Amino acid sequence: QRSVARMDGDVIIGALFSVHHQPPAEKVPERKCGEIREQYGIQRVEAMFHTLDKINADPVLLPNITLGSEIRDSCWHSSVALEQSIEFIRDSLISIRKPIAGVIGPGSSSVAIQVQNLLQLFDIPQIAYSATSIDLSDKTLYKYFLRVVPSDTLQARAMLDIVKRYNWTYVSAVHTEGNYGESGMDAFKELAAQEGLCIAHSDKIYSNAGEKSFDRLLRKLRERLPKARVVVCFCEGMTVRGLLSAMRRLGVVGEFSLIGSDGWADRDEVIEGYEVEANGGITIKLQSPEVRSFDDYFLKLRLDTNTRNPWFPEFWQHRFQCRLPGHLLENPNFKKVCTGNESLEENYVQDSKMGFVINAIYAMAHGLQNMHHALCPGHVGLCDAMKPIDGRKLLDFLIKSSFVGVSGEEVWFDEKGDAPGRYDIMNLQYTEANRYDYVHVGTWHEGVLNIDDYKI
Amino acid sequence: QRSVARMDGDVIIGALFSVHHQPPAEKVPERKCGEIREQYGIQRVEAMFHTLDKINADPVLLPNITLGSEIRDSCWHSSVALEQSIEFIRDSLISIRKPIAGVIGPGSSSVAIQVQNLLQLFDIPQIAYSATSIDLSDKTLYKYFLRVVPSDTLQARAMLDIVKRYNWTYVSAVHTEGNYGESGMDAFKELAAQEGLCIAHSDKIYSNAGEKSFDRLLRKLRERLPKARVVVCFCEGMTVRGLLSAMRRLGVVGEFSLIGSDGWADRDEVIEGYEVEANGGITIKLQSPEVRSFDDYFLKLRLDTNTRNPWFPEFWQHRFQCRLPGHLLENPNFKKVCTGNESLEENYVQDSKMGFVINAIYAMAHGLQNMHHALCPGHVGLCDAMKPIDGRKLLDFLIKSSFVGVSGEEVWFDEKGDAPGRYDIMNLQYTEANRYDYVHVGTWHEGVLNIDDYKI
Numbered sequence: 001q002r003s004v005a006r007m008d009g010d011v012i013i014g015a016l017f018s019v020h021h022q023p024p025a026e027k028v029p030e031r032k033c034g035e036i037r038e039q040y041g042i043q044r045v046e047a048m049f050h051t052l053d054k055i056n057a058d059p060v061l062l063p064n065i066t067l068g069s070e071i072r073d074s075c076w077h078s079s080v081a082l083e084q085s086i087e088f089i090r091d092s093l094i095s096i097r098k099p100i101a102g103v104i105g106p107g108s109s110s111v112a113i114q115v116q117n118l119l120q121l122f123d124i125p126q127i128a129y130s131a132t133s134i135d136l137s138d139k140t141l142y143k144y145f146l147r148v149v150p151s152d153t154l155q156a157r158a159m160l161d162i163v164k165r166y167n168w169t170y171v172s173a174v175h176t177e178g179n180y181g182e183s184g185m186d187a188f189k190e191l192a193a194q195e196g197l198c199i200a201h202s203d204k205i206y207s208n209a210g211e212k213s214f215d216r217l218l219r220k221l222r223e224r225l226p227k228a229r230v231v232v233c234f235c236e237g238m239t240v241r242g243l244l245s246a247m248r249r250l251g252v253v254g255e256f257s258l259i260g261s262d263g264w265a266d267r268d269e270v271i272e273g274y275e276v277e278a279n280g281g282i283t284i285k286l287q288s289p290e291v292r293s294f295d296d297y298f299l300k301l302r303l304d305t306n307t308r309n310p311w312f313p314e315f316w317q318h319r320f321q322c323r324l325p326g327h328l329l330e331n332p333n334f335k336k337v338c339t340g341n342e343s344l345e346e347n348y349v350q351d352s353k354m355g356f357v358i359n360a361i362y363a364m365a366h367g368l369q370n371m372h373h374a375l376c377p378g379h380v381g382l383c384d385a386m387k388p389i390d391g392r393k394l395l396d397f398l399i400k401s402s403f404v405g406v407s408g409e410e411v412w413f414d415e416k417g418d419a420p421g422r423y424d425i426m427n428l429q430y431t432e433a434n435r436y437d438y439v440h441v442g443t444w445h446e447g448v449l450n451i452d453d454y455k456i
Numbered sequence: 457q458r459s460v461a462r463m464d465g466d467v468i469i470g471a472l473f474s475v476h477h478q479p480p481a482e483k484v485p486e487r488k489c490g491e492i493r494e495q496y497g498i499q500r501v502e503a504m505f506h507t508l509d510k511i512n513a514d515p516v517l518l519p520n521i522t523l524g525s526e527i528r529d530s531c532w533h534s535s536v537a538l539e540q541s542i543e544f545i546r547d548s549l550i551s552i553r554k555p556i557a558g559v560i561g562p563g564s565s566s567v568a569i570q571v572q573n574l575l576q577l578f579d580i581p582q583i584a585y586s587a588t589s590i591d592l593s594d595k596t597l598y599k600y601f602l603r604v605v606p607s608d609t610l611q612a613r614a615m616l617d618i619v620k621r622y623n624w625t626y627v628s629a630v631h632t633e634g635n636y637g638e639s640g641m642d643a644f645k646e647l648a649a650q651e652g653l654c655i656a657h658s659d660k661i662y663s664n665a666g667e668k669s670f671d672r673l674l675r676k677l678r679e680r681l682p683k684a685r686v687v688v689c690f691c692e693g694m695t696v697r698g699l700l701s702a703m704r705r706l707g708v709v710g711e712f713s714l715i716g717s718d719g720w721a722d723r724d725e726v727i728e729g730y731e732v733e734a735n736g737g738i739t740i741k742l743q744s745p746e747v748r749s750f751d752d753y754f755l756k757l758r759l760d761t762n763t764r765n766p767w768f769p770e771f772w773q774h775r776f777q778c779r780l781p782g783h784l785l786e787n788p789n790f791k792k793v794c795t796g797n798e799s800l801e802e803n804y805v806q807d808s809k810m811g812f813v814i815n816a817i818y819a820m821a822h823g824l825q826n827m828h829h830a831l832c833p834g835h836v837g838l839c840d841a842m843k844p845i846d847g848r849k850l851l852d853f854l855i856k857s858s859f860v861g862v863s864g865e866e867v868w869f870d871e872k873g874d875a876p877g878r879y880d881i882m883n884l885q886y887t888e889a890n891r892y893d894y895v896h897v898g899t900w901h902e903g904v905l906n907i908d909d910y911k912i
């Protein structure tokens with residue numbers, strides 16, 4: 001009885017997008033998810049629909065084979081993503097006596113693991129756009145998993161190389177608790193122990209922990225000075241902020257210099273106010289420019305034209321805070337009544353990772369093209385060898401795929417299913433105006449550390 | 457589409473039994489299974505129905521909580537067992553908005569792995585009765601898996617202890633190639649290197665290898681005499697037999713003293729004709745007395761009073777090679793009509809592991825009782841804490857369970873989910889008629905070797 005986004009075709013690409021936030025702590029059992037999401041949700045849904053459209057128009061790629069998809073809501077939770085993934089498979093097992101060819105998603109690593117653990121049973125390839133856990137690289141455990149996104153070892157790598165470039169010997173190690181935290185640090189600690197660096201103080205904390213928890217963290221960090229000067233935070237955007245708040249109450253400022261992972265990146269949202277305590281820090285952003293195209297598509301979207309996305313109505317009302325002349329999903333919660341002509345441009349922000357989400361889809365497309373070229377030579381449409389499509393076949397076939405990234409970037413996969421790492425080094429500093437801004441100071445292109453030393 | 461055995465209750469225990477043989481080599485894709493099975497199938501089906509009945513009758517075990525089950529056909533194949541297992545979960549996810557509480561089965565280890573890999577993703581405990589492979593003990597990989605029978609490893613300890621009891625210094629090491637062979641031997645070879653024993657000659661061979669392969673094995677074994685006097689075979693049934701055939705052509709006779717694993721056990725099948733080449737060997741059987749009760753129940757089964765087993769009709773006709781006039785399940789292959797009241801005794805042989813299959817069920821029962829005693833205090837029936845039942849909770853619960861085996865035997869589980877050792881020491885010798893009979897000469901109850909020395 002949960003909603004599903006469908007668009008028909010010859011080969012159906014199935015995706016898992018966090019359309020709604022995850023179910024509240026106590027409702028997980030009955031699997032009723034929370035409020036709707038635009039960035040990690042409605043956009044990506046529309047992104048897939050859109051992308052898939054551009055492709056059915058490209059006369060070069062997948063000529064007379066239409067790509068269709070079935071998009072399900074992951075609610076950013078294993079509990080549900082699995083609930084849905086089952087259905088991918090249930091349905092598939094049936095149209096064998098339309099089936100899924102592969103799956104784009106899910107967004108979280110800790111979840112993509114669950115999806116992969118289930119999806120791999122049934123020879124369904126899985127391409128991910130933001131799952132950076134480094135456990136996924138173990139192809140003995142996650143054989144049918146790949147990503148259009150780099151692995152996090154590559155990030156502990158770039159962070160270490162940053163620590164290397166500046167002749168540093170002792171660095172504190174703080175990271176967010178969980179998978180994102182452990183994975184990366186586990187790779188830094190080790191990648192570090194090799195290159196020589198001696199890890200000074202080492203701690204771990206939950207992003208949603210009390211001020212008490214952080215204060216205890218800040219103390220410990222300070223006590224290990226002056227060696228524990230450089231703190232390396234493989235931390236979630238808020239683990240950092242939390243650490244800054246601990247610096248506010250303790251009134252210390254300028255004691256620590258930081259190096260943070262894409263959890264922090266160049267988000268204003270993290271150093272809000274705390275511009276000072278969190279100044280001069282260096283962070284890793286993810287290399288990915290906003291898609292020219294998508295913006296033009298996701299904005300001229302109307303409440304009465306969009307026929308394929310059953311969530312729009314819900315979304316739309318939540319996005320403008322208003323309720324309709326009755327409907328089926330009339331969201332009562334509101335006092336105002338939608339005109340239906342509101343503009344999606346007020347406070348519009350394209351999904352950050354939005355670039356990746358598309359690459360992923362393409363890989364799934366390209367993968368199919370190649371499978372076709374080899375298994376149906378000369379043939380224009382789909383031949384008996386791809387009716388139905390073979391899992392393990394499409395898999396190694398996706399692995400051996402290369403295409404022009406959504407932004408003139410090159411895209412391919414190594415033997416483990418990972419992607420090449422292109423990072424951006426960010427530094428927080430005082431410019432000319434009254435602004436504390438994130439200044440781009442360097443790049444990391446697979447092993448190549450480029451820092452404009454004079455810009456820091 | 458595929459039939460399912462269903463008995464309603466308050467907590468539904470799900471089971472996977474090989475009702476049919478596995479689908480022929482080339483039909484696996486469409487998943488159509490072969491001929492019906494009585495021992496590994498109809499009996500166990502009936503065994504579960506039966507057992508569950510005695511438990512709904514026991515005044516003490518689950519007083520006002522009826523145990524029900526849903527029994528599905530595994531066809532002794534991953535392809536299908538998974539197909540069905542999905543349904544356990546499909547259904548289960550649904551009643552959350554009747555669900556499975558746990559699963560008895562499957563039969564094979566290589567399969568139980570697939571079932572466990574899927575069943576674990578949804579917090580469904582899994583109790584197995586004949587899956588003995590060692591890998592399942594890794595709880596980091598098969599967290600929700602346990603059994604009421606020991607691992608293969610245990611065996612080694614008992615085989616070695618047998619070697620220890622007789623003051624032997626040099627033994628030959630032969631075993632089957634594959635999962636079984638390597639596992640056990642790997643544990644012997646090591647358990648042996650500790651206790652002191654010096655491994656003389658050491659070899660490994662495939663059960664389905666040519667007479668050439670074995671002859672080469674036999675030679676090598678002999679050459680290492682008189683030290684390589686005691687050969688320790690951690691071998692499948694036929695690996696042994698094959699070795700006997702090698703002794704026939706080379707015309708040699710009992711130069712060796714064999715010690716074989718449950719692959720050989722007390723199977724007449726293995727020493728067919730070669731009663732002489734192999735007479736005297738010592739083997740390890742798995743203690744499993746026949747169930748008094750079951751026999752009485754399975755035999756008085758009428759084709760018209762037994763409605764809960766949908767397979768009976770099919771089975772019945774295949775068991776007596778006759779058809780049933782105008783039936784919804786009338787078989788055409790046969791020539792003469794079924795009297796309907798043929799006797800199920802002609803050549804009746806109770807399932808060998810039939811004892812285990814029941815223990816398993818009980819554990820699932822007992823497990824539930826305890827979760828009830830702990831979580832529904834004051835309530836006689838099921839309380840909101842068990843509506844629905846919690847996976848991870850029932851599981852570690854099951855673990856901490858202990859009950860009187862179906863045959864006085866004690867039953868519990870260690871922290872990995874494995875069961876206690878209960879090997880029976882069989883020796884082949886000449887008794888009273890022209891029968892070479894396996895004679896029971898000793899037991900191994902977790903570390904305790906007991907051999908009636910005078911009986912050998």
Ligand SMILES: *[C@@H]1O[C@H](CO)[C@@H](O)[C@H](O)[C@H]1NC(C)=O
Nearest residue numbers: 514515518519520521836837
């Ligand atoms: C529970 O079952 C027993 C007999 O099996 C009966 O005496 C008792 O009344 C039952 N309890 C309830 C609440 O019905």
